[PDB]
């Protein structure tokens, strides 16, 4: 059998993506993983309690009707994963957390080459970020139970449920770009550091 | 509204159309005419003298169908480069990473890209997501793309068609405009009159 998950470094970095109140609009259709916030909160608490590196990514927009524009309620972090004073928050304007943000240079300057990723949506900004992270040479564990996405019509006109959308993105990501795993296994690997 | 190029120099970017992808190990594919659609685009680009780049995938992994110096590494004959044409080799999924692609495009003002190749959901999608987020105007010629069957993370066997359809839906609007090669070829004919 495969060996249990083990971190190669003593400083894996938790990267939480776009966990902002905007995504709670019921108009964005059904989501999967109703306890994703709780899974992310558990990772965040563990990282904080161990003094491990962590970065919150959040999405900004200049579009005047965007729920992500400054001052709008949707732009705020979800309270379950609200940053603390002094924690690193990096804002982005496109899907990938690397583009226009200086994230790669910051990670490399600090030796943070192993990433634990969670957030929303699995298939949009999470996937965009993870594909680039893997191809840039980062070792990525995607905590899939801390991720969620939404129902989406495919190009042939078939409604795919959020679960289906999630499952197809994970299948495209695993092996090729990252190791897909669960938060419980990640938390267990911390104890081995 | 029917497709219209914003520039007079859209660039054709053909991704990883190498004999490797014919290996039955990849599993079943969709879009059996993708090669012919790509050949039609390539011939039109050549005939019109428009910008074009072939992206080639290279591996140092001993088991890969794209391992250099064996037949799978060669371009498919339908879309084989010709002398003087730009070929950029990559070692990861995205055509931007570890190559000079972005800088080359920007130095020449090649901000509008027409993309086709293989696989829709792997290297094509990785390249297109980055292109769109980098600010390139991308038209994805979906009939010139193909992919393979894959089992989703919940055990459901998806056909190549279904995989393709899901990637196109994720790509369209957010990262690119999905369209057909016939659309694209018609739009080339309208450039001159828009000058």
UniProtKB/TrEMBL annotation, chain A:
Residues 63-82 are annotated as: Disordered. This is Isochorismatase-like domain-containing protein. Keywords: Hydrolase. It holds the Pfam family Isochorismatase. Residues 13-155 form the Isochorismatase-like domain. One of its GO terms (molecular function) is hydrolase activity. It comes from the Bacteria. Gene3D superfamilies: Isochorismatase-like. It comes from Chromobacterium violaceum (strain ATCC 12472 / DSM 30191 / JCM 1249 / CCUG 213 / NBRC 12614 / NCIMB 9131 / NCTC 9757 / MK). InterPro entries: Isochorismatase-like_dom, Isochorismatase-like_hydrls, Isochorismatase-like_sf.
């Amino acid at each position: 059998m495969p060996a249990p998950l083990r971190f190669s470094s003593d400083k894996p970095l938790l990267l939480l993506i776009d966990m902002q109140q905007a995504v709670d609009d019921p108009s964005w259709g059904p989501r999967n993983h109703p306890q994703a916030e709780q899974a992310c909160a558990g990772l965040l608490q563990a990282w904080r309690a161990r003094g491990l590196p962590l970065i919150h990514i959040r999405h900004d927009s200049v579009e005047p009707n965007s729920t992500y524009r400054p001052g709008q309620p949707g732009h705020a972090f979800k309270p379950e994963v609200e940053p603390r004073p002094g924690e690193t928050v990096i804002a982005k304007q496109t899907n990938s957390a690397f583009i226009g943000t200086g994230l790669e240079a910051l990670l490399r300057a600090n030796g943070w080459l192993e990433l634990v990723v969670a957030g929303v949506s699995t298939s949009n900004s999470v996937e965009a970020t993870v594909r680039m992270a893997g191809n840039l040479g980062f070792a990525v564990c995607l905590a899939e139970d801390g991720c969620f996405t939404f129902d989406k019509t495919d190009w042939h006109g078939r409604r795919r449920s959020a679960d289906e959308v999630h499952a197809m993105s994970l299948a495209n990501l695993d092996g090729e770009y990252c190791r897909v795993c669960g938060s419980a296994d990640i938390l267990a690997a911390l104890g081995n550091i």
